[PDB]
Structure 1
Amino acid sequence: IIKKELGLEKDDKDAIEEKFRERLKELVVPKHVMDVVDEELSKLGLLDNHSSEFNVTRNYLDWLTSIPWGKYSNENLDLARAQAVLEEDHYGMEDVKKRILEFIAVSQLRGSTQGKILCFYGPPGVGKTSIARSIARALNREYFRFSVGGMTDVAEIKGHRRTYVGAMPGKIIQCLKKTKTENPLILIDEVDKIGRGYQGDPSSALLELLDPEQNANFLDHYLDVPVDLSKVLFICTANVTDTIPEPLRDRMEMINVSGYVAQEKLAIAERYLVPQARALCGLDESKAKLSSDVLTLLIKQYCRESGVRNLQKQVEKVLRKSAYKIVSGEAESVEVTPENLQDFVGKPVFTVERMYDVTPPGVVMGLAWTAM
């Protein structure tokens, strides 16, 4: 009789309870999180809408329910299709392609899908992030990048305490929420650039995150409940393998993707850079056209490094000027040649293949494995 008194549609509350219950209904939910959710919902019902603790509880519970619990993307396991996709998206990097095909084969033979760490160390402008994206799309697992360079606040990995209003969880929980699956392709960039300064030491958090047995029970300070990271396929990138911590260096297989000789760079530019920048500039093959000799000249006189990004800048510049010459300029179409090249990009920069070609007495050439 006490209960049956002025129901008045229950004041429109407790609908969030059913909403969260149906949201979790599709997921395979562990017992720990399930009991936490039940107790949290009981407290929420006990509370009123205005209370700040109620708002914090709602935020935490929304974060928890938005997590993919037992939800795994339909991973691609066909090897020929993945190989074709990788070859159609990037050139060379045969070791990475073989490693990914071998990973696919073991996962298929191993039943369920798994993920292990493997770092792509090599000079910049080589295609590590791009190949990470290619792997993500070919293998069908979602993608998400993460810049750890120069980072000192470990809260980016381990989140906040969830108590201080406005506190946010670790970036990995954000990635899990966005991707909507427990088998993404996470990428950590600039691992070697960590400073781990005052109040930092995020390398310990990284060790806890990548350790194949500890990571399975990884938890952030915000969402104290642990999560399973035995299937995440992490990727790490660094131009040098020395400054990276030893405990983290020895915890992954380091794959080298290094350098692109003139012929290799020319092939890459002909088949992958020019079309990409052309589509970026809203152009077509007929209107804007470059000759292989022009690309060779750009490589050999306007760009001197193992990477490729500078060649990307030069090709983008020439395509931009072609677009200007097309929209307002007299020329409806462009046929770029070295003779014309002088006006598209300017006079050559690197006029000398070397400091000199005589090597006078007392001086000798040598080779250096610098960071870039």
Structure 2
Amino acid sequence: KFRERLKELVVPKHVMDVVDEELSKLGLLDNHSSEFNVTRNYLDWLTSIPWGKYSNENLDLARAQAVLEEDHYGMEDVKKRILEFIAVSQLRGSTQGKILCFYGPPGVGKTSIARSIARALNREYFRFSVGAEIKGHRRTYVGAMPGKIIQCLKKTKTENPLILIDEVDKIGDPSSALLELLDPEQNANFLDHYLDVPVDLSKVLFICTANVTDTIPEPLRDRMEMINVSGYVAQEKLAIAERYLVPQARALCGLDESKAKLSSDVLTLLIKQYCRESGVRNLQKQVEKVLRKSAYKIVSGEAESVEVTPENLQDFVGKPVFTVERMYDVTPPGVVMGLAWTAMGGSTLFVETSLRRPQDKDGSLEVTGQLGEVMKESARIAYTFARAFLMQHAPANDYLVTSHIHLHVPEGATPKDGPSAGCTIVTALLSLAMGRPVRQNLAMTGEVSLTGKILPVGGIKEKTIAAKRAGVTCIVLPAENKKDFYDLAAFITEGLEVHFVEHYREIFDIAF
């Protein structure tokens, strides 16, 4: 029946050659022996991997956009990039060349996006992790198995699958092996150590995902096309949780929407107070935790149906991780709110100032708060410019030249650095010297120079998110960050009175 296992299948010549040769050599050897079964399994491997079997590619872009939009809420930029890639492939006739690569924070959708791409192109999906072995062993009874790519071919029974090289930056020589594999001039002749026969891999589609692009091979990055999968703001995370995460968790726990319900407000609370990373890896474990507690509560008999609510969520997940996010609600004359940029989101922080000695020989500035060198220098520059600005504005003030000030950025255990918060420190010093509080729900961020120019900053997205989350109504940015601010979703910047300044005098007019 071995001839029937490849009868209807189109076979090349030099493959049927080895097939008939092994059939004749198997008729030579004795059945049921330590020589027969080996060659039997080898001849099985020759007659198992397809040769002429394909999958009709999905060339249409509308159907591709539909199948990409069904799953994976959000991701509009990655979706646009995938659609453009399919367009270039359709227009080029083939799909070889560069090899796509998705990189970003963990648990962000880089494997499921490759699965959805495979479903888009009607290619058969297959993933093998590279976190030698991709070439198979030799038939000296040591390794009686082919490589994982040959097993991909056998499994998907299609000559043009979509193989996913997941976590390519966790690879151990496999580096040069992959470098040769992805090459389209060595692609047609991939000789594996198990099958002496070459196999054409010039129709398979390769995708690889990683988290950091600091892996060992640089000539990969010459052939790999990098695509960046960013994080998710809280709204997108809530939508993802309501549409994909909670259903799957219910399926895994055996519950259903009637028994245990997670409303929208409790999900927003869970995201806002427990899971602030760029992915959904933590929110997934949190909803699974809730559903396990609920399963126990319904099976044990404490309640025939459980309803989670923002006044008993801590009974399910424990204590909230984050907090009120506003140390001040009304700022005294000395303090001013600045914005910080972590790697796990934004943050709001205040800058406090006070007299250190009674009377309001020059003055001094003492600086605390675990500040880096760049931040201490920013404080020095802000001190100088604040003295100059007060001299030119109120030449009869005598403050800031005779007073001894202490400047503290609260949460003194946290090390903090950066050239931003220069305008914040200038505003704090000025508002203390004039005895006037700044506008109440006013945040600012910007690097000041010695003459007052406001220089651009980084992380405008995270800072603006953290400002909107803290009840900021007016935010002040450098004018060279107008682009960065306007490349934000309309719901992030919807209710903020924004001001773009180039010199500090405009900040002074806004804050006072």
Normalising to structure 1: TM-score of the pair?
A: 0.82
- TM-aligned CA deviation for residue 115 of structure 1: 8.7
1:357/1:212 CA distance change after superposition, 3 Å: farther
1:338/1:47 CA distance change after superposition, 3 Å: same
Contact 1:68 1:182 in 2 (8 A): yes
Contact 1:116 1:231 in 2 (8 A): no
* Identical pairs, percent: 99
Deviates more, 1:335-344 or 1:136-145: 136-145
Question: SS at the partner of 1:60?
Answer: helix
1:61/1:368 CA distance change after superposition, 3 Å: farther
Contact 1:162 1:169 in 2 (8 A): no
Tell me whether 1:328 sits opposite 2:300 in the alignment. yes
Deviates more, 1:345-354 or 1:140-149: 345-354
Tell me whether 1:49 sits opposite 2:35 in the alignment. no
Q: Alpha-carbon deviations, 1:43-83, whole Å to 9, x = none? A: 12222214433322111111111101121123333332332
Structure 2: gaps of 5 or more residues: 342-510
Question: SS at the partner of 1:368?
Answer: strand
1:103/1:293 CA distance change after superposition, 3 Å: same
Deviates more, 1:120-129 or 1:343-352: 343-352
Q: Distance in 1 between matches of 2:333 and 2:191?
A: 63
Contact 1:143 1:186 in 2 (8 A): yes
Contact 1:192 1:240 in 2 (8 A): yes
Q: Alignment length, in residue pairs?
A: 343
- TM-aligned CA deviation for residue 309 of structure 1: 0.6
1:98/1:236 CA distance change after superposition, 3 Å: same
- TM-aligned CA deviation for residue 238 of structure 1: 0.8
Q: Give the greater-gyration-radius structure (CA).
A: 2
Contact 1:79 1:105 in 2 (8 A): yes
Tell me whether 1:347 sits opposite 2:329 in the alignment. no
Residue in structure 2 matched with residue 137 of structure 1 by the alignment:
119
Residue in structure 1 matched with residue 181 of structure 2 by the alignment:
209
- TM-aligned CA deviation for residue 356 of structure 1: 12
Deviates more, 1:281-290 or 1:304-313: 281-290
Greater fraction of residues in strand: 2
Contact 1:95 1:255 in 2 (8 A): no
- TM-aligned CA deviation for residue 357 of structure 1: 12
1:357/1:66 CA distance change after superposition, 3 Å: farther
Q: Distance in 2 between matches of 1:183 and 1:233?
A: 7
Normalising to structure 2: TM-score of the pair?
A: 0.60
- TM-aligned CA deviation for residue 160 of structure 1: 0.5
1:56/1:357 CA distance change after superposition, 3 Å: farther
Question: SS at the partner of 2:312?
Answer: helix
Contact 2:96 2:184 in 1 (8 A): no
Q: Distance in 1 between matches of 2:328 and 2:23?
A: 76
1:76/1:292 CA distance change after superposition, 3 Å: same
Q: Distance in 1 between matches of 2:81 and 2:293?
A: 41
1:45/1:71 CA distance change after superposition, 3 Å: same
Greater fraction of residues in helix: 1
- TM-aligned CA deviation for residue 299 of structure 1: 1.7
Higher relative contact order (CA 8 A, sep 6+): 1
- TM-aligned CA deviation for residue 297 of structure 1: 2.0
Q: Alpha-carbon deviations, 1:327-347, whole Å to 9, x = none? A: 333433333211010111111
Contact 2:105 2:231 in 1 (8 A): yes
- TM-aligned CA deviation for residue 363 of structure 1: 16
Q: Distance in 2 between matches of 1:112 and 1:81?
A: 19
1:315/1:48 CA distance change after superposition, 3 Å: same
Deviates more, 1:265-274 or 1:130-139: 130-139
Q: Distance in 2 between matches of 1:54 and 1:366?
A: 77
1:30/1:286 CA distance change after superposition, 3 Å: same
Question: SS at the partner of 1:166?
Answer: coil
- TM-aligned CA deviation for residue 259 of structure 1: 1.0
Deviates more, 1:246-255 or 1:281-290: 281-290
Deviates more, 1:109-118 or 1:220-229: 109-118
Contact 2:189 2:198 in 1 (8 A): yes
1:27/1:355 CA distance change after superposition, 3 Å: farther
